[PDB]
Amino acid sequence: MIIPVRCFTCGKIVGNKWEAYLGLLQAEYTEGDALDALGLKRYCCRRMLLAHVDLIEKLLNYAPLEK
Amino acid sequence: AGILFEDIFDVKDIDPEGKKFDRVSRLHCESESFKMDLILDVNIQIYPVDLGDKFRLVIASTLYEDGTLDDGEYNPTDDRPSRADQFEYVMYGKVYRIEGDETSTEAATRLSAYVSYGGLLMRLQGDANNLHGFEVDSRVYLLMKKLA
Amino acid sequence: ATLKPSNKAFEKKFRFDYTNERALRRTLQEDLVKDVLSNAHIQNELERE
Amino acid sequence: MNAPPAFESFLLFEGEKKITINKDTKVPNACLFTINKEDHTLGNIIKSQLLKDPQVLFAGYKVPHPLEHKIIIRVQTTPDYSPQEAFTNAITDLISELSLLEERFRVAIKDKQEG
Amino acid sequence: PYANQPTVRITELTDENVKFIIENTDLAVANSIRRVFIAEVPIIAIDWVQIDANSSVLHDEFIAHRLGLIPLTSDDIVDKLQYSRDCTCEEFCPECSVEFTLDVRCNEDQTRHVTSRDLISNSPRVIPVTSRNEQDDILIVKLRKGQELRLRAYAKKGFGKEHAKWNPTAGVAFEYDPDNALRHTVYPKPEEWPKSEYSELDEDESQAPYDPNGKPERFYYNVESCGSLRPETIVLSALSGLKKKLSDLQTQLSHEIQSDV
Ligand SMILES: [Zn+2]
Ligand SMILES: [Zn+2]
């Protein structure tokens, strides 16, 4: 759903990398260059950022229960 | 003082049938003082052996220079005089077969003693007059030393 | 061990040979060898067997 | 539904002897140190440090079961020595190792921070 | 019959990782040190949450778990704080915990990103790593216009053995014998394997020759910190923790010997 906080394998913080990763993709970076620029060297952290599906942005399109 | 065999074995071949294992190699050797063929398995990883080397093999029932049976136990905290210090390669095995050329009526002139050093096998075949102390189910050593 | 072997092998492997003093000497101790060679009752029992 | 609490791995449940010594009768001068709420972190170092002792004839450790959090260390020494004394010297030596390594690491850290 | 005399050589030291080499030590000691780096270095991590209001699309357990994984600065305070289990107080106190609070409401039309910057702590020494003045703030949850999230967390002192959130490392690259001299591994085709960064061999060579008299020495380490503890403080706390574990074990041992003596 939302970007995890730690990498499941090693434990590196990735929760603060999602927005930067998207900003780089919109900045015409390749997924590899972006993951390197963010400092994600292990392929486990690269897996975390490269395989994530941000569904929360679509769950926020539904009106809430309380206004 | 317990020694059951002692002779030099000029190495004549190593793994003639091809290298089957990695840290072990089969040596086909022959002596000069007694003319006894030998097929031995050694750990060439820690004790490398080259074609043409010459070593002294001393098959003994105990390592202690004085006649004294062993307990078959590993006790490295034993400072009594052991004959292993004067050698390089030392093995410990048991005789599991002694073949020969004995017939229904004639005795055995040629023998072939097989020993197993925890898997590393040796076949020492030659004249029976020199392999009289070899008996099956008997713990023995190797005491192999390479010389020039 | 007594099904496939031919008659010749069967006899050479199962008929106790009590006439070969040399073979008896090697396989059996002196007392046994002398008893087997001399006593005829033992030989007859072996043949019956 | 049956998940044991995570603190069970290190915290002793109650009235639990952190360490128990049982004299082994199979061979002389041998003992079994059953340590509770421990794992390979200490079992391995203690085994290694006992193996370094020339008066120790046997030194090994095991974890009887990964779900359980106990460890068994078997120690056999020469008759003039004792397994309890061996275990005590092994721990003292490991402590000295960690003290010295910590001191040298502080020194290295300072030297690197300055230049 | 006694201890060895290990040495240390730091080859790189930064705010993110520390790369060092330990020599004249046993493999068991080096492995235990790595295991302590991973599982037995105490740090401060949220371990108690009280959701007073949560209208977001993520349920309470999800928000709690996500807050738990947020690293908190634990450099010098973790040594002062005690374990909540050992503290003789009521629910909490400044000696055994650090209060946090969060109160966010999306009043605007744009999505509100609840980040670690919204975690207000009562102690200025314990704050989110992203909050220590680069790296962006950890994202806790996104909120829609009209949604609200209000909670009250408490951080505790713990180590990795209790939960992964109390693991201060983001990777401990432990290596030894870069050139396979001890032959602890057996490469079927040594030419097909790459060279370790700590390897000292010509490119024409694949692995060093076998050393029968060799013993594992010169262990290389690369302790990448998550942010809670400085990379060197992780090592110091690990060595001190392992020495304390051995000291307490020695106390129990002596008490057991004198039990029978
Ligand atoms: Zn990772
Ligand atoms: Zn308290």
Side-chain angles (χ1 to χ4, degrees), chain B residues 61-73:
Chain B
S61 63
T62 176
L63 294 174
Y64 309 153
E65 293 177 350
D66 289 345
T68 302
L69 61 83
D70 62 84
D71 289 345
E73 293 177 350

Side-chain angles (χ1 to χ4, degrees), chain A residues 6-14 40 42-48, chain E residues 170:
Chain A
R6 319 288 208 84
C7 170
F8 305 131
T9 298
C10 71
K12 186 180 171 64
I13 296 302
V14 290
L40 305 179
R42 294 185 278 288
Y43 59 89
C44 66
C45 311
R46 300 171 78 88
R47 167 273 311 274
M48 303 290 322

